[PDB]
Every structure is written in C-alpha cells, then in structure tokens.
Design a binder for these strands. Structure first.
Ligand SMILES: [Zn+2]
Length: 266
DNA sequence: CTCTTTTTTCTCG
DNA sequence: GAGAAACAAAGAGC
C-alpha cells in the first residue's frame, strides 16, 4: 500500500468501526506488535475506537482517551471486517473483536507493524521518523522542496522514495509521477530546473489526489480503480500513451523502475 | 533444484 | 550510497 491505498483503508475504517468497543484482542503472531502484544491487549481491551487518522503511509487508530495504535501495512498488509464466526485464514495475525464483528489483520510477508503509543507521543514519533510533508497544496511547500533538490546529488526516484521530501510515494506512484512530470528516475536532483521542479511538485499532489479519489490501485480497499489509470508501472513493453515509444523497465537503487525513454530524457 | 521478483531500516566500507 | 535483511509465494529456467 502507498498513501492512496492507506487513505482508502482509513476512510473505510472510519465509516465502520468508529464508536466500537473492543471486546477482546487475540494474536497468532504477537511479535508484530513492536511495543509488546500482551501489553497492548491489557491496555486496549474494553476501550472504544474514537477515530482513525493517517500520516504518510501510517494508519493511526485513536482509541480510548489517549491511546494511539500506529499501524504500517508495509508490502502486503491487509485488513478486513469479518463475522465473529469467520474461519481463520493462513496469514491472519491479529484480530480486534467487537460485539458484532471483528477487524482482522493479515500479512503474508509478516512485514507490517503495530505500535501502541500515547496521544502526546504521536508528533514526536513522526518527527523521529523524519517523515516529510503531506502531499497537499497547503502542506507541501514547493520552495523548501526546491532548495532540498538543489543541494543534493541523489537520484530523483530514490530521493522521493525516502518519504523525506514529501510523504506517501511508493514504487507505483513514484514511477507514475516521474512519467507525468517527464523526468528520468536517475536524474540527479541538483540538475532539475525550476520549471521541472514545479511540474514535479504539482504532479505529486495531483496523482496522489486522483489515486485517492479512485480508491487506490489493486478486504478493505480492494475496490480501487486507479490501476486502470496507470501509465507506466507494470507496463513494460507496452506503448507510451503520449509518444508511442515502448515503456522500459530498469533497476534503480534496487527497485523495478518503469519509464518512457522519449518522454523522460536521461 | 536455483534465481528473481514483489516498505522500511540496517551494516558495510 | 550499495546491498541486503525482515518474510512468503510464485514463476522461469537448469
Ligand atoms: Zn513517451
């Protein structure tokens, strides 16, 4: 999940579990609770879910008066709302049981994480992670973005993936954004001119907001439509919609990287 | 059979 | 920065 997929999950959870009292919590893989499973079970059992927020790719359950459960889905994490009698599935790891159903977390690769912290610890938690601004016109200041790009020799794709210039891009939307902005993923950032940086800035906001509107690319969130709008990601060998050149795939800083060699000049 | 492929954060040099 | 670890599964190829 990237930011649009996490936001989609957030919205669905907000609609359905806000106001629910947690009756019990069970784990078959307690080790994914980085702050300690038995501790979380003791603290949250009997508390009511008050809200669900998001920061970058992180989900934040607001529970009780002053608890915040920070959940990261990493590569394959999936939530679903199931009946209390639902059968166990192979990669289900945790469940919060309510009176009329349960929220189950599954993750084939076991990468996803849960951390229980307090309300006043949330802002420091994200400062420590060095997460950059949300991708909105209000929060994503082009001027600082420009200054950071000017002073780095990092390649644009991996720098964007750091979450530090702006929060929320993963492999799919970084590839999509760079195609939209006509920038090659290996471009050193200090080579980008002002007009390119402006187009990149706006393209990041536009692509992510579009993906949110379309419910993400493809349990909660599994109804997305953004996948039908992808121009390069996973489109190796197909033709660029703009110029007709074949989309190419290369490896950049360890990641599969899809681009048009005409539209995105090296 | 081996090798490659698919978010974050570490070690290494 | 480069490479790989955390982990599981699927596909290609010998
Ligand atoms: Zn093109």
């Amino acid at each position: 999940p990237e930011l649009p997929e996490v936001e989609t999950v957030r919205r669905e959870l907000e609609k359905r579990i806000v106001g629910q009292k947690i009756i019990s919590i069970e784990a078959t893989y307690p080790r994914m609770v980085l702050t300690g499973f038995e501790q979380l079970k003791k603290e949250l059992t009997g508390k009511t879910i008050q809200g669900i927020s998001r920061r970058g790719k992180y989900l934040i359950f607001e529970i009780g008066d002053d608890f915040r459960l920070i959940s990261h889905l990493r590569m394959e994490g999936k939530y679903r709302l199931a009946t209390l009698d639902a059968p166990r599935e192979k990669h289900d790891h945790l469940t919060m049981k309510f009176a009329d159903g349960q929220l189950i977390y599954a993750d084939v690769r076991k990468f996803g994480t849960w951390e229980l912290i307090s309300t006043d610890q949330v802002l420091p938690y994200f400062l420590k992670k060095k997460i950059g601004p949300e991708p909105t016109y209000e929060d994503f200041d082009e001027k600082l973005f420009r200054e950071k790009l000017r002073k780095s020799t990092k390649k644009i794709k991996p720098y964007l993936l750091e979450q530090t210039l702006v929060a929320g891009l993963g492999n799919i939307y970084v590839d999509e954004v760079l195609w939209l902005a006509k920038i090659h993923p290996e471009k050193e950032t200090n080579q980008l001119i002002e007009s390119s940086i402006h187009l990149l800035h706006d393209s990041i906001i536009e692509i992510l907001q579009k993906a949110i509107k379309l419910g993400g690319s493809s349990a909660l969130g599994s109804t997305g439509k953004m996948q039908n709008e992808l121009q390069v990601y996973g489109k190796t060998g197909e033709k660029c919609s703009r110029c007709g050149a074949e989309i190419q795939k290369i490896k950049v800083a360890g990641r599969g990287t899809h681009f048009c060699p005409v539209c995105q000049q090296k």
